[PDB]
Amino acid sequence: GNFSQACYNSAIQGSVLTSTCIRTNGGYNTSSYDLNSVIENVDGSLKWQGSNFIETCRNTQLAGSSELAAECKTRAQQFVSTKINLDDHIAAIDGTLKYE
Amino acid sequence: LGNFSQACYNSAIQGSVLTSTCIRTNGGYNTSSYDLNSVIENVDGSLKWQGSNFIETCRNTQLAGSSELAAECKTRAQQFVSTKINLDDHIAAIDGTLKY
Ligand SMILES: OC[C@H]1O[C@H](O[C@H]2[C@@H](O)[C@H](O)[C@@H](CO)O[C@@H]2O)[C@@H](O)[C@@H](O)[C@@H]1O
Ligand SMILES: OC[C@H]1O[C@H](O[C@H]2[C@@H](O)[C@H](O)[C@@H](CO)O[C@@H]2O)[C@@H](O)[C@@H](O)[C@@H]1O
């Protein structure tokens, strides 16, 4: 992961991370990644190893340079605040965001 | 700058998914899909960017023209109204793949 070490100007909109990432040989590339493919809402907590969190979470934002923050529903249908460190698994490879 | 439709053909919408066949940077074609539920919200019956999960409260999605998502979305008063959003605002063709 550790995309924040290779990328700047990051943003979250919905479930999409956008960032400007350095290419292997010099310049930069504007990249995006749909985190809904790799993050699950498990009883109100954002977790890796699943998908589809955006269906039951709201108010997604980037906190700091690499944390996704949101408000997600528990199984009992109550919203709680939750965060996950995207640097755990999101990398930049030759300027493109990828899940590792 | 979005504008995928300038490089893409045979686009279709099914549920929240856009699929299109786009010309690659150096030639040939690639087909890819994009889950618009990641980045479009239903705000009181109107589709808007800067949110997510419109599909939960919208139905009858289709492609209008070459780049417009048309749908019927529920207002706060719980009635379906027609709405459209131009996917060229934010969806681009990047070397033949749809990206935000
Ligand atoms: O329904 C979509 C939802 O399914 C899964 O989440 C379950 C649970 O962990 C959630 O707390 C509640 C919230 O209503 O929904 C499900 O029971 C996950 O796959 C989740 O990512 C997804 O949004
Ligand atoms: O419930 C899912 C729904 O939540 C949000 O939409 C709200 C509002 O704008 C809609 O008009 C009504 C329709 O019932 O629902 C909510 O109150 C948005 O996140 C929307 O994308 C989503 O489908």
Numbering used by the authors:
A (entry chain A): 2 to 101
B (entry chain B): 1 to 100
From the primary publication:
Functionally, they both bind dimannose, yet the affinity is quite different, with domain B having tighter binding affinity (Kd = 15.3 µM), and domain A showing weak affinity (Kd = 400 µM). To simplify our analyses, we used a designed CV-N variant, P51G-m4, that contains a single high-affinity dimannose binding site (domain B), folds exclusively as a monomer in physiological conditions, and is more stable to thermal denaturation than wild type. Second, we apply our ICDC approach to blindly predict and experimentally validate mutations that allosterically modulate dimannose binding in a natural lectin, cyanovirin-N (CV-N).
We chose position I34, which belongs to category and is 16 Å away from the binding pocket, for experimental validation. I34 exhibits %DFI values lower than 0.2, is at least 16 Å away from binding residues (distal), dynamically coupled and co-evolved with the binding pocket. We found that I34Y binds dimannose with tightest affinity (Kd: 64 µM) of all the mutants tested, a twofold improvement over P51G-m4 (Kd: 117 µM). To glean more information on the mode of binding by I34Y, we determined the X-ray structure of the unbound and dimannose-bound form and compared it with the template protein P51G-m4. The fold is highly conserved as shown by main chain RMSD of 0.16 and 0.20 Å with bound and unbound I34Y, respectively, and tyrosine is well tolerated at position I34. The binding pocket region is also structurally conserved compared to P51G-m4. Analysis of the polar contacts between dimannose and P51G-m4 and I34Y shows an identical number of hydrogen bonds with the ligand, indicating a conserved binding pose. The ligand shows an RMSD value of 0.75 Å. These observations suggest that the increase in binding affinity of I34Y toward dimannose might be mediated by equilibrium dynamics, which are not captured by the crystal structure.
